[PDB]
Design a binder for this molecule. Structure first.
Ligand SMILES: Nc1ncnc2c1ncn2[C@@H]1O[C@H](COP(=O)(O)OP(=O)(O)O)[C@@H](O)[C@H]1O
Ligand SMILES: [Zn+2]
Ligand SMILES: [Zn+2]
Ligand SMILES: [Zn+2]
Ligand SMILES: [Zn+2]
Ligand SMILES: [Zn+2]
Ligand SMILES: [Zn+2]
Lengths: 596, 187, 590
């Protein structure tokens, strides 16, 4: 019931009730926090408010302790005594509390709204314990904000997988995505019995949407689907593993001359072992995961773990390992979760396989000799601390590109985050350097690689496999039928309708797109299996269709264009209004009637 | 007590006393100041003692009276609970057998111990061991209290279903043995 | 038992004594009320009296805390404090008494006698909760008044169905009708037991009264029939729900290509759909209850319940729905008494139906999807919030016409009441206008619509049928009692009896008499289809007979006559006694 001061590591029995995470605080720290912020609510072994019957005096300052109980000033016993005095607040460890200077930032984090970019950079630079607390309360705020949406009810029932939704007028409708499950509550004569969770998907038509439910119960009119809540568990282990170095290669047994196809990184494989942790920066579509497989083959006896922020990314890594690493291999990623279909190869929890590959959402708290963490930009400090708590190895690798898509941060409505501010791993990579470099985007066309090198890069990216039918059909954006927050742009497919029955060889393509719902409209009329820009960054394809939306701040992201076309290998076609980008991308653009 | 008439009168008496002390007047003036100070003290006494005396009684009256209100609320809650329990319990008994045996009685009053003996709809039997199980509820059906009962479901002590085929001489020393047998009324 | 205040709505638990309904008041609000009004009694967890048995002072102006109880000055203990606070009254909660000053109107509510139109109009102008409290206390006042009614010290009884009635001296001997409820009490030095729910109407002729009770003995001499009063229950729901605008339909199931007269009203139905509710403000006779069944035809899928003010209107609605909508999806809820007959062909109180009907006072406490109410003019603001509390649906429809006559409100014996102030809904209708309006009296032909639009209504009304040439008149006076005994014009009855033979298709003409005695005696003489206006409200007939007895504020009412004539279809014959009123209309005299 007791703990160490969050800002002093001083043993104490006080936690601020009005604060969210209410960690332990020394008497001086608690006094400063309560006297600075309006958080006049401290949770000791008991609450502090007046013990008189019917009296609701709350402020600790107004409270006076009396006959073994607290009181208001009016109900004060003949021997009364105020609580908040002498620069401290009454409690255990009172005389032995140390006190520090972190009142201002603690108050700011306890009173910030997480909407502005200041919270992220503050959490990206603050104290280690403060970093942990900020990440915890950041995820807590994220969960609470999602828990403020509207309840989905029914207007009429169609079939087992078709149903009209009757949202409450005036409430924010949650996007009808796969990751949006809502428990089904039917009310009869009370019988307020849940019928299970239901996820929705906007089909090619009206309110009647196709939905997947955990249970096959009959869809009744007297049933609705309330949002499914989530909780945040406390994190104690630090985010970033401290930087160490070793004179000799320790905890790793080098191989002699095997796998020379990655001999450009063998000296790098040894130097990773002679350090503690060695992050690696690789431009989108470069020899990423090739360094990883080379290192894994260089140390076959050592136990190795892959880690990626995205399920698609870890699926790509595990597929690369299956193709390259010997099967002593498994990818223990996801048993039944992750609506986006991840591996279907081997065990999910056996902890006997060597090259155990997993993801944050189902990380087993085990240990290995080394572990490689990929896609280090689309994650937050919270998940970094989580993964550092789960696993613990002798050497760590954090491979990732700052010029990629960061964590969503749906509340980041003011400004944005710099590639250095995405997470503390990104900071460490971008303050002094990633202490490593691997740039060679050979798996992508050298023409598009050069154009990207002329887009935001310094022309340090070289590749092969140039041209082909690379183009960007300059079709103006039509009507935007955005049924959800994301923008649907079907008239862009209105020119793809002439790219479906015309192409004799452009059939095995993966249509990437900025917005998720404009990927959903391609899923409505499937000319080919499409993927969103979020499923990119780690698996490439020969052809990639690309249709954007109106000139919003989302589609016009240069990093989005980079990570979208770096999944192309021979050719590319993009459908944008193209007001400014049609001149920097050196492709032979076409038109609506000119496709031959 | 700081906003009382005696407070102001004592304040002006003190102002006069300090003014005449700083003036340095005759000893008779000093005696007048002492008399004024002393009467101001006595006037300040009751006006700073009586109100405090009334404060405590007012506060305790508040506490007692809040307690009484709480008592009334609890009374209402328990009354509602009792009556809803009565009404929800009575509605699972009115078999017409009850009316039959009540009317057949000479005035209406019948002993209590026979009502569940005749109008009951389900029988529960607890059994110590196998030997007693033999000469009682043997087979799928049996008789007791001049009626026919058919066995439906049998559980053990730990509330696990036990199949009738398992109940035997040789298999007996493998079961928890307060066997409970529930049965229905065969008409 | 603690609640909010009313003027300030702060959490408190004080109530007033002299105020009949005993409402929750805060400290400052109660202090203001007792300072202004003559209310000198406050209720709390205990009553306020001088605890000393040698005193009986209940005034809150002076009361002294005798340790734990209240005392007078002559019994005040030495160490004790008066409990009249610093401009408030001491008690439950004082630290959270929010301030509000609009007490003067509230004081007037607990002051006035409801005999002046200023009372009633001022009542419908205050805060919602104040309006509810005023309606409640008005209803209670009416109940108390009707309680203090005649104690019939009868002496003779005629038959098993007929008796002789005589009354005491001093209290109002109420009229006799099936609407009222009476019961005799056997005074045999003991056993003053109820003799049953006894209704009473005046007999056929002479000093004769017809009696019918729940039990029926042969009544003795010493009994008496006293009018008892029913209790009034408090309410919480608002009288009027807020309005919300929409974009698309609110989840209703249409029926494509069903009828034709309502495809033009489909726009109006969608206008209803795009909001939480809608109303109807139009002249009588012109698609009122008829704009209803077609609207149901637009969305005849949900399980619904409706009702009406009086019985004739709801029975006509049942007949119309049977005519248009399928029978076995509609029902009509009947009361337990049911002394006044109803649609005696339909389901006998089938609450489990898709389109249900009922009366105002016998409504259940279930819910529906949509609903429509009949004749807001005939209703008050009390019953509006009553149905709001018991019934809560997703769409509400209201119909009414300001030109109609309002509820009796017998205590208002001074002045006329403006049609908007009939209820809150009528004020809203006259201030913001209608939601949808229909103006072409369809049952009456052009001559009747011309007469009504030229004389009382605005010259805007039109019809669809030409003159039926069945307009006739009569003016000669006749003689009445002139000493109580509400006027009966017997010579007119005799002349009608002598004449009628010449009028072939007028043998079944609906006779009209607002006065109960004339209404009974007309059927007693010949047996015409007798009827009163009140009960003709919202009805309609091919052949009607109206009869004016004499001149009076009742019989000279413009609204009464104009609502009487809106019920003409193909034929009518009516008589007057008034010259200028005889000359006002534009029909043939004869
Ligand atoms: N559009 C219409 N076409 C034909 N008859 C109508 C129409 N509207 C109303 N009526 C007639 O009016 C009668 C009902 O009266 P109504 O117009 O509903 O007003 P209210 O019932 O309040 O007097 C019905 O018998 C119906 O025949
Ligand atoms: Zn705090
Ligand atoms: Zn501290
Ligand atoms: Zn207190
Ligand atoms: Zn009062
Ligand atoms: Zn008040
Ligand atoms: Zn007294």
């Amino acid at each position: 019931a007791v703990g160490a001061c969050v800002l002093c590591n001083s043993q104490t029995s006080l936690r601020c009730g009005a604060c969210i995470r209410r960690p332990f605080l020394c008497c001086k720290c608690c006094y400063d926090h309560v006297i600075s912020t309006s958080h006049k609510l401290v949770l000791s072994v008991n609450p502090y408010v007046c013990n008189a019957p019917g009296c609701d005096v709350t402020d600790v300052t107004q409270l006076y302790l009396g006959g073994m109980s607290y009181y208001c000033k009016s109900h004060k016993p003949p021997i009364s005594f105020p609580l908040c005095a002498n620069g401290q607040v009454f409690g255990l460890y009172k005389n032995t509390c140390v006190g520090s200077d972190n009142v201002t930032d603690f108050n700011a984090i306890a009173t910030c709204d997480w909407t502005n970019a200041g919270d992220y950079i503050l959490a990206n630079t603050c104290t280690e314990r403060l970093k942990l607390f900020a990440a915890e309360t950041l995820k807590a705020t994220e969960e609470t904000f999602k828990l403020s949406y509207g309840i989905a009810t029914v207007r009429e029932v169609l079939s087992d997988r078709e149903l009209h939704l009757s949202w409450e007028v005036g409430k924010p409708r949650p996007p009808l995505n796969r990751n949006y499950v809502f428990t089904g509550y039917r009310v009869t004569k009370n019988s307020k019995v849940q019928i299970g969770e239901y996820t929705f998907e906007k089909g090619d038509y009206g309110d009647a949407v196709v939905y997947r439910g955990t249970t096959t119960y009959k869809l009744n009119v007297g049933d609705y689907f309330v949002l499914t809540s989530h909780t945040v568990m406390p994190l104690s282990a630090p985010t970033l593993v401290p930087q160490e170095h070793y004179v000799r290669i320790t905890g790793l047994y080098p191989t002699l001359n095997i796998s020379d196809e990655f001999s450009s990184n063998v000296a790098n494989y040894q130097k990773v072992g002679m350090q503690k942790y060695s992050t690696l920066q690789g431009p989108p579509g470069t020899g990423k995961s090739h360094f990883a497989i080379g290192l894994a083959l260089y140390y076959p006896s050592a136990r190795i773990v892959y880690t990626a922020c995205s399920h698609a990314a870890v699926d790509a890594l595990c597929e690369k390992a299956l193709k390259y690493l010997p099967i002593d291999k498994c990818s223990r990623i996801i048993p039944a979760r992750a609506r986006v279909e991840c591996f279907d190869k081997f065990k999910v929890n056996s902890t006997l396989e060597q090259y155990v590959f997993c993801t944050v959402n189902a990380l087993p708290e085990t240990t290995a000799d080394i572990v490689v963490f990929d896609e280090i930009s689309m994650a937050t400090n919270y998940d970094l601390s989580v993964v550092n708590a789960r696993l613990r190895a002798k050497h760590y690798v954090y491979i990732g590109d700052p010029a990629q898509l960061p964590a969503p941060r749906t509340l980041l409505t003011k400004g944005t985050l710099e590639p250095e501010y995405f997470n503390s791993v990104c900071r460490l990579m971008k303050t002094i350097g990633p202490d490593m470099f691997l740039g060679t985007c050979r798996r992508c066309p050298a023409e598009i690689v050069d154009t990207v090198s002329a887009l935001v890069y310094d022309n340090k990216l070289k590749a092969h496999k140039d041209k082909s039918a690379q183009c960007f059909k300059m079709f103006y954006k039509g009507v935007i039928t955005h049924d959800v927050s994301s923008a649907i742009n079907r008239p862009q497919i209105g020119v793809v309708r002439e790219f479906l029955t015309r192409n004799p060889a452009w059939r095995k393509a993966v249509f990437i797109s900025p917005y998720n719902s404009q990927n959903a409209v391609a899923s409505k009329i499937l000319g080919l299996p499409t993927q969103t820009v979020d499923s990119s960054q780690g698996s490439e394809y020969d052809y990639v269709i690309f249709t954007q939306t109106t000139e919003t701040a989302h589609s016009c992201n240069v990093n989005r264009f980079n990570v979208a076309i770096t999944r192309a290998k021979v050719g590319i076609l993009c459908i944008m209004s193209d007001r400014d980008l049609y001149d920097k991308l050196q492709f032979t653009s076409l038109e609506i009637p000119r496709r031959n | 007590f700081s906003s009382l008439p005696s407070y102001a009168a004592f304040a002006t008496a003190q102002e006069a006393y300090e003014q005449a002390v700083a003036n340095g007047d005759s000893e008779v003036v000093l005696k007048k100041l002492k008399k004024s100070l002393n009467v101001a003290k006595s006037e300040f006494d009751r006006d700073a003692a009586m109100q405090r005396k009334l404060e405590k009684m007012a506060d305790q009256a508040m506490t007692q009276m809040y307690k009484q209100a709480r008592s009334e609320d609890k009374r209402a809650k328990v009354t509602s609970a009792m009556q809803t329990m009565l009404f929800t319990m009575l509605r699972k008994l009115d078999n017409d057998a009850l009316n039959n045996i009540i009317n057949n009685a000479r005035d209406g009053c019948v002993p209590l111990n026979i009502i569940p003996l005749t109008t009951a709809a389900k029988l529960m039997v607890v059994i110590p061991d196998y030997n007693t199980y033999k000469n009682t509820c043997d087979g799928t059906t049996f008789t007791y209290a001049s009626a026919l009962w058919e066995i439906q479901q049998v559980v053990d002590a730990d509330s696990k279903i036990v199949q009738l085929s398992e109940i035997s001489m040789d298999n007996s020393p493998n079961l928890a043995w307060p066997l409970i047998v529930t049965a229905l009324r065969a008409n």
